[PDB]
Design a protein around this ligand. Structure first.
Ligand SMILES: [C][C]C([O])([C][C])[C][C][C][C]C1234B567B189B21%10B32%11B543B645B786B917B%1021B3%114C6571[C][C]O[C][C]([O])[C][C][O]
Lengths: 10, 239
């Protein structure tokens, strides 16, 4: 649901 | 006095900030060029999007932030992004002409530039007053980074699952800040400093609110939403 944020967080 | 863990916390946040805020603003050249309606939307949209990535980088380095769930990290970031951007921008803000000086003329922003992004004085007016008040505090960089970290780890953000853990993380930072002010910040500059810093967090909530309202209004219009970025759309909201 939040692909980019998720990617940037991990 | 400052325990060893607190000195550690300050050290970590200082480094994290130094790794996510480039005072030479060299990357601003990769953004779509500024145009001096809504002629500044492309440039500021890219600047904001960039800033979102930098805030995230800072957040991940906050002692304890990682121990939070994926969903909680996401909720905290989406709700604080605009606030941390406003807060971190105080570093480039100057009370000489009430503007943000990021190196060169092309990269120096004022009330006009922000309105040329679609925002009104309803937001800009209180935003400038905020910058001024925060600037007047003359925070030590230590206090500046602690304030941004505390802003990100707020227990009351809507949608927070493990609020208890969030508060625990934030308290650790709060106590670090309160102690630092007492141990390292000399009077009179330290007079009610903590209370004043916390008040700035309250001011940020209303700024956040007004920015959101105007953002939903602007982005509701397809032609404007088209000028944004995928990250801005995902983080700030997509109609
Ligand atoms: C894209 C969403 C939008 O709603 C349009 C629909 C536009 C919202 C623009 C928000 C912003 B820009 B302007 B104010 B705040 B940011 B940037 B510009 B002004 B403050 B901060 C500002 C000063 C620039 O600081 C530079 C650095 O020291 C901080 C970098 O992190």
């Amino acid at each position: 649901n939040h692909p980019m944020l998720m990617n940037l967080l991990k | 006095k400052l325990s060893e863990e607190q000195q550690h916390i300050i050290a970590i946040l200082l480094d994290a900030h130094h790794k996510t805020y480039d005072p030479t603003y060299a990357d601003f050249r990769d953004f779509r060029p500024p145009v001096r309606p809504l002629s500044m939307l492309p440039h500021l949209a890219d600047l904001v999007s960039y800033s979102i990535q930098k805030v995230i980088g800072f957040a991940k380095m906050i002692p304890g932030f990682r121990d939070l769930t994926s969903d909680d990290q996401i909720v905290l970031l989406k709700s604080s992004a605009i606030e941390v951007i406003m807060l971190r921008s105080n570093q480039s803000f100057t009370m000489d002409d009430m503007s943000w000086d990021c190196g060169s003329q092309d990269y120096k922003y004022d009330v006009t530039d922000v309105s040329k992004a679609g925002h009104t004085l309803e937001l800009i007016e209180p935003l400038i007053k905020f910058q001024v008040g925060l600037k007047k505090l003359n925070l030590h960089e230590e206090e500046h980074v602690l304030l941004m970290a505390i802003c990100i780890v707020s227990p009351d953000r809507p949608g927070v699952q493990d609020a208890k853990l969030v508060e625990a993380i934030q308290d650790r930072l709060s106590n670090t800040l309160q102690t630092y002010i007492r141990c390292r910040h000399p009077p009179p500059g330290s007079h009610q400093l903590y209370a004043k810093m916390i008040q700035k967090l309250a001011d940020l909530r209303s700024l956040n609110e007004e920015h959101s309202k105007q953002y939903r209004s602007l982005s509701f219009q397809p032609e404007n939403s088209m000028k944004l970025t995928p990250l801005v759309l995902e983080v700030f909201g997509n109609e």
